[PDB]
Each structure stands twice: as structure tokens, then as C-alpha cells.
Amino acid sequence: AEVTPADVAGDTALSTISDSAPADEASAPRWRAHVNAADERVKEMWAYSPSMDRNVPLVVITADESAGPRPVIYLLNGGDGGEGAANWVMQTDVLDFYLEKNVNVVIPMEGKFSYYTDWVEENASLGGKQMWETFLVKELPGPLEEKLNTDGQRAIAGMSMSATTSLLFPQHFPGFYDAAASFSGCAATSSLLPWEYLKLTLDRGNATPEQMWGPRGGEYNIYNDALINSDKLRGTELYVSNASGLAGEWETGGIIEAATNKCTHDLKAKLDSAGIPADWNLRPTGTHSWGWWQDDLRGSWTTFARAFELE
Q1: PANTHER family recorded for this chain (predicted)?
Q2: What secondary structure does DSSP assign to 246-276, as a single string?
Q3: Which residues are annotated as a binding site for Mg(2+)?
């Protein structure tokens, strides 16, 4: 990317990366055993967020040195946030897949039910102040990409809940990301049904969407509506898979599938009209299990290999 961490960070206080968990740590996270059994290139790191006053755990797949500096993919969990069992590390072969590709991958393992955004209000059930966009875009990339010796290329990817996030970030900071992958999410967030998706997701974290983005239809909600602002994606390589998997956040299914499908219909029509191309994963399958999410890691490699110019 031509845009650097410092370009987007402004004067934001930066994260401090640590190679060890906080001494404060009560018990070992469920995912630690998976990291410990993997190749040495898979690391547990911790990043302090000044804006949240939070130590955020990261599972990091590091590239090898055979080709020098390599790109980094910021890969977000869905509503689970990495805080329960339903996440990339514990349910897919994400570690093995990317180790083989020789690329850096950063998977935050907190942020449940947060949409990885900056919230208008604090919510104690989700740890208080939530400033995930500030963290992921402004606090973290400078120090982290330095530590990983990246080549200066980067991508953002998310599934389900965070498949909204992965469209909003490049719209909010055009050029910072070479590529963005949205695995089964809703780009829209301010119209009636998409707002209900936010409600359903946030309810699992004892939260409401007003706490997160303010009144429905208000200026901050629209800023965080990735359908309305879709033209701002221009220049980003894109991968988008159909939104039916989004209902997995909430655990008839006919109406739910038809409703969430409109998210993808609307986005493709809007990108198509604007002449903004994407790689599409639209063929319906029998399930949107972890096998389907894992398959999006393969599908999106087309987009990432192209954006990053990797052999």
C-alpha cells in the first residue's frame, strides 16, 4: 500500500507489543494450546491499547525470511471475537494454510460482539471502553508491522459480524489496505433490516446498537454503513462472499436467509453500477459451517495473491 501506518495514525498514542501475556492473567485462553502445538512461526503476542486501556491478545502467523519482508493480513473473528470456541484458530486450519503461503497474519483474540469499531458508549459487559477501530487502524499497525518486518503491503479480512468491519475500514482510510475480504456479512447497517442484524449480534454481548453507533440513521451510523459509502472502496482489491452465513451469529431460516441475502444483492448491484470490481463467492451451499469459512480463506487467496503480487 502507498499509505503508511504513520499516515493514518496521526498523533494517536501507539500500542506497545509484548511477547508474553499480562502477569494479571487469571487462566490460560482456550486457544493457547493450539498456538503452542503449531509451527514456531506461529506466535502469541499481546498489544496494549492506550485508548481502551486494554491488553489485547493476538495470534500471529509470521512469514519466513526466505523472500524478505512479506505482506500482513489482519484477519478478524466474527462475534465470538476469539473469546469463546467459535473462531478461526479453534475451528479451522488457518495456521497451516497461511504458514504455507509465507505471509504474516494477525488475528486479534478479543473483541467479542464489538463489530471491531469505536463505540459511542462504554459497556461493562464488553470490558468498558471499546475503540477497536482506533486500535486496529491507528494504534497497532505501526509497532506491529515494524516487529514483523512487513513489506508495507496489508489487507483486512473479516467474517460474519466483522465482514462489515472489513468493508468499513478501507472506506474510512482509503489506500491503507491493498485488499479487503468480506466473508458473509452485511455492508448496510443503517436501514431497518441491517440495523436488526446489529441488534441480534449485540444482544449476545448484552449491548445495543445505539451504544455502538448512536441513533439509527444518525451521522455516525451512516459513516459506518458500508453500503451507503461503497464508492469509497474504489482502488481496493475486493473479495466478497454471500451473506447467508451471517445468521450463524444468532445460532424462517428461510426468511432469515432471504433477508440477509439482500445485503449481498444490494452491495454487488451498487459496486457494479460504480464500476468497482470484486472477486465473488456466490454459489449457495448446504452449510455455512466452519468448512465454508475455511473455504473463504482459499477463495480470498486469489484476491490477496493478486493485490500483493505474490508468486
Answers
A1: DIACYLGLYCEROL ACYLTRANSFERASE_MYCOLYLTRANSFERASE AG85A (PTHR48098:SF1), ENTEROCHELIN ESTERASE-RELATED (PTHR48098)
A2: GGGG---HHHHHHHHHHHHHHHHHHHHHHT-
A3: 110
